[PDB]
Amino acid sequence: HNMKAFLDELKAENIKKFLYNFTQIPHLAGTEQNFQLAKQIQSQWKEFGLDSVELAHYDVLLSYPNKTHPNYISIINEDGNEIFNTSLFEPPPPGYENVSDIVPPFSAFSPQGMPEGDLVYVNYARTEDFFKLERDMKINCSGKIVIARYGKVFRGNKVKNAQLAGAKGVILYSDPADYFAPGVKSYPDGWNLPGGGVQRGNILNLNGAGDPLTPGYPANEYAYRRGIAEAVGLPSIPVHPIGYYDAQKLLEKMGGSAPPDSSWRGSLKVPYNVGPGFTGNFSTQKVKMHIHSTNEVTRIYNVIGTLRGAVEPDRYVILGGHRDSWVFGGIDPQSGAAVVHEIVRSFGTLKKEGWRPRRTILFASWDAAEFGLLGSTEWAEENSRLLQERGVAYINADSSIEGNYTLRVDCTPLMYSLVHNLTKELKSPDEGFEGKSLYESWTKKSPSPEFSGMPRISKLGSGNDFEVFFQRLGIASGRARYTKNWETNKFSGYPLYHSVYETYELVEKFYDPMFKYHLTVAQVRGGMVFELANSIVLPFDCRDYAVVLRKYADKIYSISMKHPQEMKTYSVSFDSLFSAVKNFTEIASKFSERLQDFSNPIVLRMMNDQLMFLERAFIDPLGLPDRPFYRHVIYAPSSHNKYAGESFPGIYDALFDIESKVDPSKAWGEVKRQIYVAAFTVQAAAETLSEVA
Amino acid sequence: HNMKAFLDELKAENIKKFLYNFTQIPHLAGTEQNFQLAKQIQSQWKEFGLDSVELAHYDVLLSYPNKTHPNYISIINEDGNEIFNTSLFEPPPPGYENVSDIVPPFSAFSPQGMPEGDLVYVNYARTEDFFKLERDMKINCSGKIVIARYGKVFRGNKVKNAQLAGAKGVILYSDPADYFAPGVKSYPDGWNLPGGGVQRGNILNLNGAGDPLTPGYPANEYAYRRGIAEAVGLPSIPVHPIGYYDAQKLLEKMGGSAPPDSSWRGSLKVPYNVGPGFTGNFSTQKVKMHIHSTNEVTRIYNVIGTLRGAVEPDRYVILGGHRDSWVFGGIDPQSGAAVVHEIVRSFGTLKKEGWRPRRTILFASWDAAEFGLLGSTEWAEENSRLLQERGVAYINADSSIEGNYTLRVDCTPLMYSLVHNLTKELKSPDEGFEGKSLYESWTKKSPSPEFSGMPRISKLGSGNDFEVFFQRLGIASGRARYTKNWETNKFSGYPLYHSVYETYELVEKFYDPMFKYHLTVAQVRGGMVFELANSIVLPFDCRDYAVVLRKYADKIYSISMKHPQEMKTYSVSFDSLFSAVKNFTEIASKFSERLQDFSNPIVLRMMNDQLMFLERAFIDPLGLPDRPFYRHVIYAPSSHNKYAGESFPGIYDALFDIESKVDPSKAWGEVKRQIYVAAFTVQAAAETLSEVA
Ligand SMILES: Nc1nc2ncc(CNc3ccc(C(=O)N[C@@H](CCC(=O)N[C@@H](CCC(=O)N[C@@H](CCC(=O)N[C@@H](CCC(=O)O)C(=O)O)C(=O)O)C(=O)O)C(=O)O)cc3)nc2c(=O)[nH]1
Ligand SMILES: Nc1nc2ncc(CNc3ccc(C(=O)N[C@@H](CCC(=O)N[C@@H](CCC(=O)N[C@@H](CCC(=O)N[C@@H](CCC(=O)O)C(=O)O)C(=O)O)C(=O)O)C(=O)O)cc3)nc2c(=O)[nH]1
Ligand SMILES: *[C@@H]1O[C@H](CO)[C@@H](O[C@@H]2O[C@H](CO)[C@@H](O[C@@H]3O[C@H](CO)[C@@H](O)[C@H](O[C@H]4O[C@H](CO)[C@@H](O)[C@H](O)[C@@H]4O)[C@@H]3O)[C@H](O)[C@H]2NC(C)=O)[C@H](O)[C@H]1NC(C)=O
Ligand SMILES: *[C@@H]1O[C@H](CO)[C@@H](O[C@@H]2O[C@H](CO)[C@@H](O[C@@H]3O[C@H](CO)[C@@H](O)[C@H](O[C@H]4O[C@H](CO)[C@@H](O)[C@H](O)[C@@H]4O)[C@@H]3O)[C@H](O)[C@H]2NC(C)=O)[C@H](O)[C@H]1NC(C)=O
Ligand SMILES: *[C@@H]1O[C@H](CO)[C@@H](O[C@@H]2O[C@H](CO)[C@@H](O)[C@H](O)[C@H]2NC(C)=O)[C@H](O)[C@H]1NC(C)=O
Ligand SMILES: *[C@@H]1O[C@H](CO)[C@@H](O[C@@H]2O[C@H](CO)[C@@H](O)[C@H](O)[C@H]2NC(C)=O)[C@H](O)[C@H]1NC(C)=O
Ligand SMILES: *[C@@H]1O[C@H](CO)[C@@H](O[C@@H]2O[C@H](CO)[C@@H](O)[C@H](O)[C@H]2NC(C)=O)[C@H](O)[C@H]1NC(C)=O
Ligand SMILES: *[C@@H]1O[C@H](CO)[C@@H](O[C@@H]2O[C@H](CO)[C@@H](O)[C@H](O)[C@H]2NC(C)=O)[C@H](O)[C@H]1NC(C)=O
Ligand SMILES: *[C@@H]1O[C@H](CO)[C@@H](O[C@@H]2O[C@H](CO)[C@@H](O)[C@H](O)[C@H]2NC(C)=O)[C@H](O)[C@H]1NC(C)=O
Ligand SMILES: *[C@@H]1O[C@H](CO)[C@@H](O[C@@H]2O[C@H](CO)[C@@H](O)[C@H](O)[C@H]2NC(C)=O)[C@H](O)[C@H]1NC(C)=O
Ligand SMILES: *[C@@H]1O[C@H](CO)[C@@H](O)[C@H](O)[C@H]1NC(C)=O
Ligand SMILES: *[C@@H]1O[C@H](CO)[C@@H](O)[C@H](O)[C@H]1NC(C)=O
Ligand SMILES: *[C@@H]1O[C@H](CO)[C@@H](O)[C@H](O)[C@H]1NC(C)=O
Ligand SMILES: *[C@@H]1O[C@H](CO)[C@@H](O)[C@H](O)[C@H]1NC(C)=O
Ligand SMILES: *[C@@H]1O[C@H](CO)[C@@H](O)[C@H](O)[C@H]1NC(C)=O
Ligand SMILES: *[C@@H]1O[C@H](CO)[C@@H](O)[C@H](O)[C@H]1NC(C)=O
Ligand SMILES: [Ca+2]
Ligand SMILES: [Ca+2]
Ligand SMILES: [Cl-]
Ligand SMILES: [Cl-]
Ligand SMILES: [Zn+2]
Ligand SMILES: [Zn+2]
Ligand SMILES: [Zn+2]
Ligand SMILES: [Zn+2]
């Protein structure tokens, strides 16, 4: 009973069977079908051998279209005649044209409204796109309906940016430039997005809060809820997503200013004029949105499985991923959930033979992730005291594949060495690398930008269920999946993301017919969980944090040094931060020496507690400015793109666009405050690794 | 080497020698004399045998009178002639009339100003005193100078209340009613306050923040400081304290309204007229303050001594008390510091013989406590990560005596059983109880209001250095001292508190000639530290928390039930809170069973960690409303009196004066929110005691 036994028990054929099982009907959060799936998973995890398997339910704010009053967009003429209407649904895929309860495309949490106005095209609706419009082009979005292409940044940030520009509505669409790979056919004949395809998704700006009505506390049966007016993160203007056939009809008549440059042009045969409004002949026509979606407090269900530890049952290694989907969830999330299911089955086989892990393993099937990470966040709010004193690590398990090219890992620096070591022991599933390690193929295909002979491992961003564990609670977190070639594939994510076309057949036909990439991902995620839960000494290398901290300090200093005169005027010094990083490096090196130089279980556990609480030490209980649930001082989701991680986010945000601030003394004062907070936090974290007395 | 050996080594004669040594010259925070004392203590603790003894320094905002521009108050006539002036200093006591550097009486952190106006007498300047003035008597304090007697509540609350009433200045004085015990002589012939005596003290409203300029972070060498305008807790109006000879001259001419009842009358031969202003003949006279004190960032020094644990060096039991004094510190704090010194000496004697405690003991000599608990708070801010993951308990050690009648203990319910057990093993020092236990004498003299044959133990309030440990960080805390008879002694604290007369001779002549009460207090504080640091199982009884939680739930429900119609209208239910308390009771009982039913050091330490993190579980990382550093959900300092503890403070404050709120729906909504937070926190704390997996 060792890791090899665990790994060998995992089967591609089982992952395939589970994926098929999980994807025959929609499992939208808050629906009966997703409750039934929760009950099925609960029953199977018990069967598989877990010690306890419970449902944890919460009543959270969700959002749904009105079944009898459909959402749509029109072009309306000067007489009020609606001369063009966007689609009411995606053409369902072959053999699913009679499937009931497919939610039509909508932007979850949009308010209701019927705004009419002139269109402005805002490219990706990024912060810099809006800078270009108002500052350079002198185009005013106030009272306009903005149309933005999906891609580059989280859609909630696009909506926030549009609101702040004064838009009265937002239309999101999928441009073939970003969602149609050259030389591949549209679904069902290939993996591209057809012109009738539409990306669903929520447009909240929760900043880690969880359920909009209950920030800080679980949405249990006696919860006090905020009124809707005080809810966290809701958009103030109506929003709706469309496909590129419909977008073409909205964009083709656009007049006003030409696009500023080629980076504003997608692939449709339209000029990509910014507007506002339509060309001469059509200048009296307008665009009208009709949004009738409703926000509803609705019950959601997490499945929580426990495999009790033999030696340290009060130490938790968590493997979690969500279960709710927009429609069939062929990739997102069921390609992940099928992998978790097989991992539970394998651990359970060992358990039935008399094995237990050293530490407790918790397995989670989260609900309502698509509506803002609600299930994971409410559960973590409920259990925060247990998690912060006992939480060793969190391994996420959403989509197992977004491509078939190579591995992708995003994690805390504390897991780098674990990931390198594990992948050296796993077989590469790649063509041309038969008999080679996954480390070799991954390193060849995705080289580290810093180091020769190492693979790229990214920072954690957000937009997935590790957010509460990592950025709020400070528990070492990681994720892994198979991905595309980022050098040659310039499209955004995978094309059929959050569409009706994301099916079992998509995966089986186009992504992973042999389920070998799924199996490799199960071995990576499961192997990480195995080592974290069973290694005598926790498999964290504090020295890897020291290396990245210096890289991040260099980076933030370099941003600041774009303003040398202001740094002179306001005496802005990074000396404290570099000092703290130098001290962290020294103390980490000495800790590492002791870790290998110590039969004493108290010194061991004392050392294991130092390892465990190291990630915890980067937490500031006061949070980041105006984002109280982003508490990690080294990493937060980018304020411009929830998906991306930002390093030293407090200093980064203080420096961002600083040359535009009206009061430079105040602005640079805040930069100096953030440097102090960061230097202090790095030093305090270092000191947790010093000898304890 | 057991507790008896430790206890037997403590000597009254040593405590006496140390007290004499610590009280010959003033040790005002931020002065050279207090730095020299820090260095002396550091050297002696090393001598005594501690493993390491370091100074931890910070640069914090302090406040001092201007040496060449003295503070004083006048009565001024209509021509601007100052016809009466308050004293510039207290007459120094016999043999100290040539002692240099006695700080004259002042209110630390007063702004500068020379406000002139009509006096209003506001009794104790409590919330209810101001209610009586504005609501019942219809007396407007706006633009008036308020005169308030010291007593009943922390003077910072009096100042806050006066500011909010619109006062332009505050005069604080010591009324003989509150500071002159019948039948006892004034110092030097007895322990009463003479008419020239004055109580120093700060008038901040920090709400746990520490240094006003650096809330959340240690005031280290690279700290970013707030500007004075944004500092935490500073008063907006000038404030000055005076003795009763001077108060008599200010009060005797008072006209306007009669005092509302006898509870507004002190003991001076004046009418205690409320005002505003003086009677007919003197109506054109006014009162003028002259305050020239300055706030100054100043270095302060904590001494931190470590006695490394033999088995659990990463578990900290802390014995701390302050060293800085207003003048000589004969009682406050040196009667406490002398006791800590002897405790360190005793532990060191055992250490030199080869003994070590099981857990690490930290000893602290805090600086700047008199200026707002600054030294303890800055150090805890610096070390917060170590303290919250490793902090077992904090035992405070300010003044050892405030009387000679019986023991006083204020502590977490987690220490009740420890305190009962220890005091049963200690000898009573009381006359008439020779050969009896301290438990017996204490129980006879200060019976529990709830339980026959038990002694009174109070809630922790604040105004002392346990505040950051207990209310911010959630570390089990306690304190003990000898006190007066609360039934027969209706004066406030001890009369010479914070005056020049608080000397070695005061203690040796009047309070404790044999140093037997000091010795008993050393045995209580030291014994608690010994048991906390050496007991195999932590000496905490979670069931005692269950009992008090029910008492507090009953109490807060009873306050709410004063408004039955509103509870019906707004559906205000305490069911969730009582449910949580019932669950806590059940889970605690089961935990206690397991604690006694389990050779396994992991189960032991797992159980010890459950005991240690139980106090920690009452912490809400979001803090209480507008008081982010008061995080404990069960206990906070009263919003009306920092000295007093309040239970379920979030609900208490939501209910306080609720019938006066303009929007009852909003006000009762907030009551229901606080019930939810409290019920959730109690349940979450209970769940930390459940089986871990
Ligand atoms: N030069 C170079 N760079 C590379 N960078 C990376 C890689 C390997 N894989 C990647 C790793 C990181 C990135 C990356 O950093 N991209 C961006 C943004 C950060 C990022 O991770 N972006 C993702 C964004 C997509 C994402 O994370 N999506 C989520 C969506 C889950 C979801 O549906 N969540 C819901 C709810 C979200 C919520 O409510 O919070 C929703 O979004 O609707 C997910 O898949 O987990 C991406 O485009 O690859 C950047 O430039 O900084 C890109 C590719 N390879 C290379 C390379 O070969 N060369
Ligand atoms: N019926 C009945 N009740 C009793 N209650 C108690 C006791 C035994 N001892 C007591 C325990 C609690 C109380 C008590 O709860 N009193 C008040 C207020 C709470 C309290 O503890 N009050 C203290 C206030 C004094 C105090 O704590 N002072 C601080 C001052 C330290 C200091 O100088 N700090 C600085 C800095 C403070 C800062 O900046 O925060 C300063 O204040 O300037 C201290 O001595 O530690 C008191 O009057 O006894 C109440 O009714 O709720 C009173 C006496 N015995 C009895 C009894 O026999 N019968
Ligand atoms: C990284 O680790 C190092 C330890 O190896 C740590 O060094 C510390 O730096 C501080 C701040 O620079 C030092 O503080 C000095 O402490 C002495 C007392 O020991 C004081 O006398 C000094 O004050 C004087 O000088 C100041 C600067 O010119 C004046 O502003 C001030 O008014 C005084 O005149 C000063 O406070 C401290 O001694 C060392 N500790 C050591 C060497 O052990 C460093 O702080 C760590 N980095 C971080 C970011 O924490
Ligand atoms: C104290 O401990 C007890 C456990 O001994 C714990 O009891 C729990 O109470 C909650 C809330 O009352 C129970 O929740 C119910 O859970 C079931 C599923 O098991 C749901 O079907 C219930 O919902 C329905 O009924 C509600 C009330 O009428 C409706 O509002 C709702 O719309 C549904 O129709 C309800 O959520 C939970 O089952 C028990 N758990 C047990 C018995 O193990 C109690 O909560 C603890 N106290 C505190 C303050 O935490
Ligand atoms: C997915 O697999 C589950 C588990 O096999 C199927 O649920 C079982 O269905 C059979 C036959 O209907 C029942 O007798 C069992 O009680 C079910 N077991 C459960 C729920 O744990 C389920 O039908 C499959 N779903 C699909 C779409 O194929
Ligand atoms: C777009 O949809 C709208 C809404 O269904 C259509 O307009 C309606 O047409 C019917 C029948 O002609 C009228 O009775 C309604 O009054 C209309 N409603 C509104 C809101 O205008 C419209 O015909 C559609 N346009 C196209 C081109 O299909
Ligand atoms: C990853 O693998 C390396 C190589 O085995 C591990 O580093 C070795 O660890 C052992 C045990 O402490 C030492 O004796 C060796 O000196 C180390 N070799 C090195 C650093 O080159 C490393 O600890 C593993 N990482 C984990 C488990 O997180
Ligand atoms: C308080 O006691 C200390 C410790 O004995 C005295 O400090 C010592 O004084 C002698 C004689 O001046 C020196 O030789 C030592 O170096 C001192 N030891 C220290 C500082 O650790 C101090 O003088 C006493 N203070 C008073 C007021 O009596
Ligand atoms: C109260 O103190 C003030 C301040 O010292 C005294 O008034 C001063 O008196 C001197 C000499 O008579 C004058 O030159 C100053 O101009 C006065 N200063 C002010 C501010 O008035 C005053 O005499 C004292 N009153 C009593 C009764 O002692
Ligand atoms: C205080 O003393 C009592 C009496 O000895 C302790 O309670 C006993 O503890 C032992 C050991 O667990 C049990 O065998 C007895 O049944 C207990 N007797 C009781 C509760 O009456 C108590 O644990 C001590 N409190 C501490 C150490 O905090
Ligand atoms: C949906 O729309 C229908 C009619 O178009 C309306 O009667 C109903 O109130 C709506 N449902 C909601 C708001 O849940
Ligand atoms: C944009 O539009 C409206 C006019 O309708 C105006 O109120 C607003 O101030 C304008 N903003 C800018 C930056 O021109
Ligand atoms: C799978 O890999 C092949 C070969 O590189 C490639 O042509 C194809 O596009 C990949 N499929 C997907 C869905 O990425
Ligand atoms: C104190 O007062 C004197 C003169 O009365 C003045 O010169 C000096 O500035 C003051 N000291 C301060 C404000 O520290
Ligand atoms: C009290 O006094 C001033 C008049 O100088 C006035 O502005 C204020 O509103 C008054 N307040 C009340 C409650 O009468
Ligand atoms: C000490 O105790 C005696 C006897 O009860 C009492 O008369 C005296 O007032 C006490 N001294 C002090 C300072 O409380
Ligand atoms: Ca919540
Ligand atoms: Ca501070
Ligand atoms: Cl993932
Ligand atoms: Cl005390
Ligand atoms: Zn997903
Ligand atoms: Zn998704
Ligand atoms: Zn004190
Ligand atoms: Zn004091």
| Tokens standing for residue A37 | 């799936």
Of the three residues B291, B325, B345, the one that is the final residue of a domain is B291
Of the three residues A256, A291, A326, the one that is the final residue of a domain is A291
- 10 Å Cβ neighbour count for A270? 17
Sequence-ordered alpha helix ranges (H) in B535-600: 542-560, 564-569, 575-597
Q: Is B448 left (phi over 0), alpha (psi -120 to 50) or beta?
A: beta
Burial (CB < 10 A; 0-12, 13-18, 19+), residue A334, is: buried
Solved with: X-ray
Q: Domain holding B155: CATH number?
A: 3.50.30.30
Minimum-distance ligand 3 atom for the alpha carbon of A682: 49
A6 and A120 assigned to the same domain: no
B116 and B222 assigned to the same domain: yes
Chain-chain contact of A222 with B575 (C-beta, under 8 angstroms): yes
The rounded distance, in Å, linking the Cα atoms of A154 and A416 is 26
Q: Which residue has the tokens 């040094």?
A: A561
Rounded to 10°, the helix B601-617/B664-687 angle is 170
Residue A335, H or E segment: helix A334-352
B390 and B316 in contact (C-beta within 8 Å)? yes
B35 and B70 assigned to the same domain: no
Identity of the amino acid at A10: L
Chain-chain contact of B693 with A218 (C-beta, under 8 angstroms): no
Strand ranges (E), A104-178: 107-108, 116-117, 119-121, 145-149, 169-173
Q: Beta strands A359-366 and A312-322: pairing type?
A: parallel
Residue A549, H or E segment: helix A542-560
Chain A interface, mutation test: which of B53, B222, B594, B671, most A Cβ atoms within 10 Å?
B222
Sequence-ordered alpha helix ranges (H) in A598-663: 601-617, 649-655
Q: In what order do the strands lie in the sheet with A116-117?
A: A82-85, A72-76, A286-290, A116-117
Q: Pick from B616, B613, B614, B652: which is nearest to B631 by CA?
A: B616
Of the three residues B523, B539, B555, the one that is the final residue of a domain is B539
- 10 Å Cβ neighbour count for B87? 18
| Tokens standing for residue A232 | 């966290």
B412 and B482 assigned to the same domain: yes
B523 and B602 assigned to the same domain: no
The rounded distance, in Å, linking the Cα atoms of B689 and A315 is 15
B582 and B632 assigned to the same domain: yes
> CA quadruple A522, A523, A525, A526: dihedral positive or negative?
positive
Judge if the beta carbon of residue B592 lies within 6 A of ligand 10. Answer: no
Cα distance from B675 to chain A (closest Cα, Å)? 9
The parent domain of residue A550 ranges over 540-693
Q: In what order do the strands lie in the sheet with B286-290?
A: B82-85, B72-76, B286-290, B116-117
Q: Which residue's CA is the nearest one to ligand 8's atom 18? A: B40
Q: Domain holding A466: CATH number?
A: 3.40.630.10
A145 and A232 in contact (C-beta within 8 Å)? no
B519 and B555 assigned to the same domain: no
Q: At CA B63, angle to CA B60 and CA B66, rounded to 5?
A: 140
A535 and A584 assigned to the same domain: no
Residues near B40 by Cβ (< 8 Å), separated by ≥ 6?
A: none
Judge if the beta carbon of residue B576 lies within 6 A of ligand 4. Answer: yes
Judge if the beta carbon of residue B142 lies within 6 A of ligand 14. Answer: no
The rounded distance, in Å, linking the Cα atoms of B522 and B460 is 20
CA A322 to chain centre: 12
In total, how many domains does chain B have?
A: 3
Give yes or no for a cis peptide into B260 (omega within 30° of 0): no
- 10 Å Cβ neighbour count for B82? 13
Q: Which residue's CA is the nearest one to ligand 8's atom 7? A: B40
A676 and A645 assigned to the same domain: yes
Q: Nearest chain B residue to A615 by CA: give it.
A: B385
First to last CA, chain B: 38
Pocket test for ligand 9, best of B85, B114, B250 (most atoms within 8 A of CB): B85
HEC profile of A4-29? HHHHHHCCHHHHHHHHHHHCCCCCCC
CA B417 to chain centre: 23
First to last CA, chain A: 38
Identity of the amino acid at A49: G
A293 and A110 in contact (C-beta within 8 Å)? yes
A120 and A217 assigned to the same domain: yes
Output DSSP code: residue A287: E
A619 and A462 in contact (C-beta within 8 Å)? no
Q: Nearest chain B residue to A575 by CA: give it.
A: B222
B128 and B147 assigned to the same domain: yes
Q: Which of A601, A680, A687 sits opposite B217 (nearest CB)?
A: A680
Residue B407 main-chain phi, psi, to 5 deg: -75, 150
Residue A484, H or E segment: none
The rounded distance, in Å, linking the Cα atoms of B17 and A692 is 34
Residues in chain A closer than 8 A to B471 (CB atoms): none
Q: Nearest chain B residue to A307 by CA: give it.
A: B693
| Tokens standing for residue B2 | 């057991």
B114 and B257 assigned to the same domain: yes
Residues near B498 by Cβ (< 8 Å), separated by ≥ 6?
A: B199, B200, B201, B326, B332
Residues near A686 by Cβ (< 8 Å), separated by ≥ 6?
A: A580, A583, A584, A587, A588
Identity of the amino acid at B451: F
Residues in chain A closer than 8 A to B317 (CB atoms): none
Residue B260, H or E segment: none
| Tokens standing for residue B619 | 């912490």
Output DSSP code: residue B20: H
The rounded distance, in Å, linking the Cα atoms of B148 and B31 is 30
Resolution in angstroms, to 1 decimal, for this deposition?
1.6
What would you measure as the largest C-alpha separation in chain B, in angstroms?
Answer: 86
